[PDB]
Design an enzyme around this catalytic site. Sequence first.
Site, PDB file in Angstrom:
ATOM      1  N   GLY A  83       1.019  -1.237  -0.018  1.00  0.00           N
ATOM      2  CA  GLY A  83       0.056   0.107   0.092  1.00  0.00           C
ATOM      3  C   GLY A  83       0.874   1.531   0.166  1.00  0.00           C
ATOM      4  O   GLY A  83       1.848   0.751  -0.191  1.00  0.00           O
ATOM      5  N   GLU A  84      -0.011   2.712   0.299  1.00  0.00           N
ATOM      6  CA  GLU A  84       0.765   3.996   0.217  1.00  0.00           C
ATOM      7  C   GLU A  84       0.980   4.168   1.733  1.00  0.00           C
ATOM      8  O   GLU A  84       0.782   5.319   2.536  1.00  0.00           O
ATOM      9  CB  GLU A  84      -0.434   5.047   0.087  1.00  0.00           C
ATOM     10  N   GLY A  85       1.413   3.010   2.207  1.00  0.00           N
ATOM     11  CA  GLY A  85       1.900   2.987   3.790  1.00  0.00           C
ATOM     12  C   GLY A  85       1.341   3.743   4.940  1.00  0.00           C
ATOM     13  O   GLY A  85       2.309   4.237   6.016  1.00  0.00           O
ATOM     14  N   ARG A 143     -10.811   2.349   6.570  1.00  0.00           N
ATOM     15  CA  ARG A 143      -9.270   2.214   5.962  1.00  0.00           C
ATOM     16  C   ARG A 143      -8.621   1.514   7.168  1.00  0.00           C
ATOM     17  O   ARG A 143      -7.268   0.951   6.321  1.00  0.00           O
ATOM     18  CB  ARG A 143      -8.599   3.826   6.407  1.00  0.00           C
ATOM     19  CG  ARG A 143      -8.618   4.267   7.490  1.00  0.00           C
ATOM     20  CD  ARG A 143      -8.416   6.058   7.332  1.00  0.00           C
ATOM     21  NE  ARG A 143      -8.426   6.601   9.168  1.00  0.00           N
ATOM     22  CZ  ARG A 143      -9.668   7.244   8.781  1.00  0.00           C
ATOM     23  NH1 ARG A 143     -10.432   7.717   8.143  1.00  0.00           N
ATOM     24  NH2 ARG A 143     -10.297   7.438  10.376  1.00  0.00           N
ATOM     25  N   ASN A 144      -9.264   1.385   8.048  1.00  0.00           N
ATOM     26  CA  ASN A 144      -8.313   0.483   9.214  1.00  0.00           C
ATOM     27  C   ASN A 144      -9.426  -1.402   8.758  1.00  0.00           C
ATOM     28  O   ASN A 144      -8.722  -1.894  10.319  1.00  0.00           O
ATOM     29  CB  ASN A 144      -8.270   0.965  10.819  1.00  0.00           C
ATOM     30  CG  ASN A 144      -7.020   1.833  10.686  1.00  0.00           C
ATOM     31  OD1 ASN A 144      -6.399   1.903  10.030  1.00  0.00           O
ATOM     32  ND2 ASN A 144      -7.424   2.778  10.794  1.00  0.00           N
ATOM     33  N   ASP A 177      -4.364  -2.238  12.698  1.00  0.00           N
ATOM     34  CA  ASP A 177      -4.180  -0.740  13.842  1.00  0.00           C
ATOM     35  C   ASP A 177      -5.030  -1.103  14.973  1.00  0.00           C
ATOM     36  O   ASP A 177      -5.515   0.427  15.230  1.00  0.00           O
ATOM     37  CB  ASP A 177      -4.370   0.049  12.824  1.00  0.00           C
ATOM     38  CG  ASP A 177      -3.111   0.460  12.243  1.00  0.00           C
ATOM     39  OD1 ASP A 177      -1.946   0.662  12.715  1.00  0.00           O
ATOM     40  OD2 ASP A 177      -3.522   1.447  11.305  1.00  0.00           O
ATOM     41  N   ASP A 183      -9.041   4.373  16.215  1.00  0.00           N
ATOM     42  CA  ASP A 183      -9.311   4.530  15.049  1.00  0.00           C
ATOM     43  C   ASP A 183     -10.016   3.666  13.909  1.00  0.00           C
ATOM     44  O   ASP A 183      -9.787   3.623  12.927  1.00  0.00           O
ATOM     45  CB  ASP A 183      -7.917   5.586  14.508  1.00  0.00           C
ATOM     46  CG  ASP A 183      -8.473   5.613  13.325  1.00  0.00           C
ATOM     47  OD1 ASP A 183      -9.339   6.755  12.780  1.00  0.00           O
ATOM     48  OD2 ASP A 183      -7.980   5.740  12.255  1.00  0.00           O
ATOM     49  N   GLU A 235      -0.565 -11.387   9.047  1.00  0.00           N
ATOM     50  CA  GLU A 235      -2.000 -12.105   8.186  1.00  0.00           C
ATOM     51  C   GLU A 235      -2.168 -10.690   6.973  1.00  0.00           C
ATOM     52  O   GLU A 235      -1.565  -9.348   7.300  1.00  0.00           O
ATOM     53  CB  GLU A 235      -3.074 -12.246   8.388  1.00  0.00           C
ATOM     54  CG  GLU A 235      -3.549 -13.543   9.162  1.00  0.00           C
ATOM     55  CD  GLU A 235      -4.378 -13.692  10.246  1.00  0.00           C
ATOM     56  OE1 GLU A 235      -5.392 -12.646  10.457  1.00  0.00           O
ATOM     57  OE2 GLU A 235      -4.845 -15.164  10.272  1.00  0.00           O
ATOM     58  N   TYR A 236      -1.795 -11.262   5.974  1.00  0.00           N
ATOM     59  CA  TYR A 236      -1.766 -10.490   4.700  1.00  0.00           C
ATOM     60  C   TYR A 236      -3.438 -10.553   4.020  1.00  0.00           C
ATOM     61  O   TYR A 236      -4.193 -11.573   4.015  1.00  0.00           O
ATOM     62  CB  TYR A 236      -1.048 -11.525   3.433  1.00  0.00           C
ATOM     63  CG  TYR A 236      -1.374 -11.070   1.926  1.00  0.00           C
ATOM     64  CD1 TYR A 236      -0.254  -9.437   1.978  1.00  0.00           C
ATOM     65  CD2 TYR A 236      -1.136 -10.930   1.542  1.00  0.00           C
ATOM     66  CE1 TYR A 236      -1.249  -9.013   0.779  1.00  0.00           C
ATOM     67  CE2 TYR A 236      -1.118 -11.249  -0.039  1.00  0.00           C
ATOM     68  CZ  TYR A 236      -1.094 -10.045  -0.343  1.00  0.00           C
ATOM     69  OH  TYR A 236      -1.157  -9.431  -1.643  1.00  0.00           O
TER      70      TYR A 236
HETATM   71  C1  LIG Z   1      -2.627  -3.943  14.187  1.00  0.00           C
HETATM   72  O1  LIG Z   1      -2.664  -4.645  12.584  1.00  0.00           O
HETATM   73  C2  LIG Z   1      -1.810  -4.405  11.647  1.00  0.00           C
HETATM   74  C3  LIG Z   1      -2.073  -4.046  10.780  1.00  0.00           C
HETATM   75  C4  LIG Z   1      -0.384  -4.159   9.495  1.00  0.00           C
HETATM   76  C5  LIG Z   1      -1.027  -4.234   7.755  1.00  0.00           C
HETATM   77  C6  LIG Z   1      -0.775  -5.687   7.615  1.00  0.00           C
HETATM   78  C7  LIG Z   1      -1.541  -5.897   6.452  1.00  0.00           C
HETATM   79  C8  LIG Z   1      -1.471  -5.125   5.082  1.00  0.00           C
HETATM   80  C9  LIG Z   1      -2.147  -5.431   4.306  1.00  0.00           C
HETATM   81  N1  LIG Z   1      -2.134  -5.466   2.878  1.00  0.00           N
HETATM   82  C10 LIG Z   1      -1.955  -3.776   2.685  1.00  0.00           C
HETATM   83  O2  LIG Z   1      -1.815  -3.062   3.053  1.00  0.00           O
HETATM   84  C11 LIG Z   1      -2.804  -3.264   1.358  1.00  0.00           C
HETATM   85  C12 LIG Z   1      -2.946  -4.439   0.315  1.00  0.00           C
HETATM   86  C13 LIG Z   1      -3.158  -4.563  -1.188  1.00  0.00           C
HETATM   87  C14 LIG Z   1      -3.764  -3.285  -1.759  1.00  0.00           C
HETATM   88  N2  LIG Z   1      -4.633  -3.168  -2.299  1.00  0.00           N
HETATM   89  C15 LIG Z   1      -3.899  -2.333  -3.723  1.00  0.00           C
HETATM   90  C16 LIG Z   1      -5.615  -1.823  -4.170  1.00  0.00           C
HETATM   91  C17 LIG Z   1      -4.900  -0.509  -5.667  1.00  0.00           C
HETATM   92  N3  LIG Z   1      -6.026  -2.915  -5.333  1.00  0.00           N
HETATM   93  C18 LIG Z   1      -6.438  -4.207  -4.422  1.00  0.00           C
HETATM   94  C19 LIG Z   1      -6.063  -4.980  -5.583  1.00  0.00           C
HETATM   95  C20 LIG Z   1      -4.951  -4.753  -2.915  1.00  0.00           C
HETATM   96  C21 LIG Z   1      -4.270  -2.675  -0.264  1.00  0.00           C
HETATM   97  C22 LIG Z   1      -3.101  -3.246   0.532  1.00  0.00           C
HETATM   98  N4  LIG Z   1      -2.397  -7.061   4.580  1.00  0.00           N
HETATM   99  N5  LIG Z   1      -1.456  -7.190   5.824  1.00  0.00           N
HETATM  100  C23 LIG Z   1       0.721  -4.262  10.177  1.00  0.00           C
HETATM  101  C24 LIG Z   1       0.881  -4.542  11.608  1.00  0.00           C
HETATM  102  O3  LIG Z   1       2.311  -4.785  12.037  1.00  0.00           O
HETATM  103  C25 LIG Z   1       2.152  -5.104  13.241  1.00  0.00           C
HETATM  104  C26 LIG Z   1      -0.103  -4.397  12.679  1.00  0.00           C
END
Ligand SMILES: COc1cc(CCc2cc(NC(=O)c3ccc(N4C[C@@H](C)N[C@@H](C)C4)cc3)[nH]n2)cc(OC)c1
Length: 287
Positions: free
Chosen positions: A22-24, A153-154, A167, A149, A99-100
Amino acid sequence: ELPEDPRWELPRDRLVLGKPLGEGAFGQVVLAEAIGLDKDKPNRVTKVAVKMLKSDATEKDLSDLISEMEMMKMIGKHKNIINLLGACTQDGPLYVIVEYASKGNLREYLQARRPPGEEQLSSKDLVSCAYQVARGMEYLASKKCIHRDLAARNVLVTEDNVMKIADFGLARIDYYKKTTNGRLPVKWMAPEALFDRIYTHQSDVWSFGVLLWEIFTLGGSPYPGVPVEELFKLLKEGHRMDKPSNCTNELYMMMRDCWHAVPSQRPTFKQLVEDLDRIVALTSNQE
Ligand SMILES: COc1cc(CCc2cc(NC(=O)c3ccc(N4C[C@@H](C)N[C@@H](C)C4)cc3)[nH]n2)cc(OC)c1
């Protein structure tokens, strides 16, 4: 130096780092492949998301990453939350393995499925999404977690369309600060949280109401063109968002109940899960 926790530790040679995710929005997150996260088998790969610190990371940036991981350890496993899968803490940079979610955030997932000028979501799919987010939230609440939050978006969406709350392990605010999309987080905040800094499961219920509104407008922007100061005025006046088009009165009354002036009078996530479960069952998949 970090203490080794063998419940979670994954050897560094077992993680193949890939393209940034993503966009960080969730910090520096990359896609990766974890070789044998499970004992049966050590030969299978799983696509995972890995969070690490940036180059310009402070001693406080590192402390927050650790706390978030430790928090995730304490919360435990649930289908409707981003789960902790492991970590690389020894002899190198910290890698927090979670998880992804391949379909991105719920705002994007919903926006791409809007009727034309991937595929369309039925009336039941939309109610199912809300049910899952309330399910996730109910678990976190039962584990004493207050999100602060909750927004679309979350909420991340997996390949199998599972709603997973992100988050939730962070603990912190500039009212004028904007998101990546150019939106203001104050728009999801309960008045008591906003004006009195009082954060509860109840202020999260307020936020859920805005999240339902986001689902029913298929990724709609709450209060477009409304600056911070004008929003304050709306809340003080007791103003409420209009009923989205193709939203039942039962579901609009749920958003309204969620936005009750009195925090004690709002439904709980336990109650929302019950109501939405009943509504999913009665919602048509034919439109
Ligand atoms: C507490 O919880 C968190 C959550 C996270 C985030 C983990 C995460 C993020 C993702 N995934 C993306 O960030 C993502 C993926 C695809 C995207 N899209 C982009 C869009 C344009 N097209 C779409 C077809 C796909 C857009 C965003 N998975 N797991 C990390 C964390 O650390 C400790 C704790």
